[PDB]
Amino acid sequence: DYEIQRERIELGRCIGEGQFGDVHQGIYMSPPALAVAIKTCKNCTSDSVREKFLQEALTMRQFDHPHIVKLIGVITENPVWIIMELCTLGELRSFLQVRKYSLDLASLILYAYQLSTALAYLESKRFVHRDIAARNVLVSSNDCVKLGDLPIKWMAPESINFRRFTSASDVWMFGVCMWEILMHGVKPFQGVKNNDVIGRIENGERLPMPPNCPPTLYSLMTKCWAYDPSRRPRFTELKAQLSTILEEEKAQ
Numbered sequence: 001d002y003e004i005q006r007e008r009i010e011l012g013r014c015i016g017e018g019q020f021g022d023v024h025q026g027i028y029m030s031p032p033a034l035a036v037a038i039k040t041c042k043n044c045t046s047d048s049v050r051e052k053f054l055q056e057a058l059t060m061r062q063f064d065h066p067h068i069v070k071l072i073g074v075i076t077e078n079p080v081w082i083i084m085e086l087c088t089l090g091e092l093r094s095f096l097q098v099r100k101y102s103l104d105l106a107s108l109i110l111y112a113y114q115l116s117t118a119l120a121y122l123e124s125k126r127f128v129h130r131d132i133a134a135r136n137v138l139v140s141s142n143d144c145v146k147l148g149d150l151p152i153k154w155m156a157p158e159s160i161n162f163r164r165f166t167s168a169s170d171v172w173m174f175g176v177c178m179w180e181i182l183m184h185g186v187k188p189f190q191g192v193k194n195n196d197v198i199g200r201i202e203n204g205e206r207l208p209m210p211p212n213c214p215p216t217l218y219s220l221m222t223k224c225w226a227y228d229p230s231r232r233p234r235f236t237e238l239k240a241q242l243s244t245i246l247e248e249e250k251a252q
């Protein structure tokens with residue numbers, strides 16, 4: 001049972017804003033003092049909203065991985081709250097931007113590798129994420145990121161054209177996420193209209209090698225962007241390859 005007694009939660013400052021309401025950090029005192037994130041819901045006084053909001057908790061409950069944000073529990077009476085593990089440093093994109101000149105390449109590669117472990121886990125669970133992007137990743141510490149929870153510019157051609165979503169289309173999106181990370185949180189296809197993306201991809205064009213990105217790593221990104229989904233690596237292979245790239249970079 002994930003129902004948490006409200007008296008065990010101390011609501012702290014706002015740390016972000018989601019689909020349903022502000023998100024706060026806070027403290028959960030249980031059998032103590034545990035930093036947590038508290039997701040609120042402006043309109044959960046209505047059951048139709050409440051049901052959708054709490055669906056997030058039901059989804060996250062299914063997963064247990066060190067690189068996926070964990071559900072701690074919920075409070076289902078107004079005001080409805082979802083209590084999640086706190087990823088204290090917040091959204092990855094802003095994190096990468098503020099630390100553009102301070103995060104070493106080994107750390108950026110580490111973040112990609114950690115994400116691939118989470119994604120290989122999801123693929124093994126036969127779960128298709130559909131929205132892999134740096135905006136959906138949270139930063140727990142300088143050495144730990146976790147997956148949170150149309151984005152045409154992140155989407156695989158088969159997803160844009162035919163609404164096909166599989167672990168392979170996730171791999172494509174992850175390729176764009178890795179590019180984002182190595183670009184310090186710049187979004188892909190800046191200045192390009194969404195409707196023009198597919199045209200460039202079909203032309204064979206791809207996001208360019210980020211400055212200072214190891215060629216072996218950029219090569220991995222391009223493999224994620226094979227047009228034919230069957231030719232892309234599986235996540236477990238990206239995990240394996242990212243491990244070696246990370247180790248090589250740690251070696252300097």
Ligand SMILES: Nc1ncnc2c1ncn2[C@@H]1O[C@H](COP(=O)(O)OP(=O)(O)O)[C@@H](O)[C@H]1O
Binds near residue numbers: 019020023085090
């Ligand atoms: N577990 C968390 N730890 C730290 N910050 C979080 C956490 N959950 C959400 N946030 C902050 O709240 C924002 C919105 O939450 P998010 O989960 O993305 O909303 P949604 O309900 O739309 O999925 C995030 O982008 C981040 O800034």
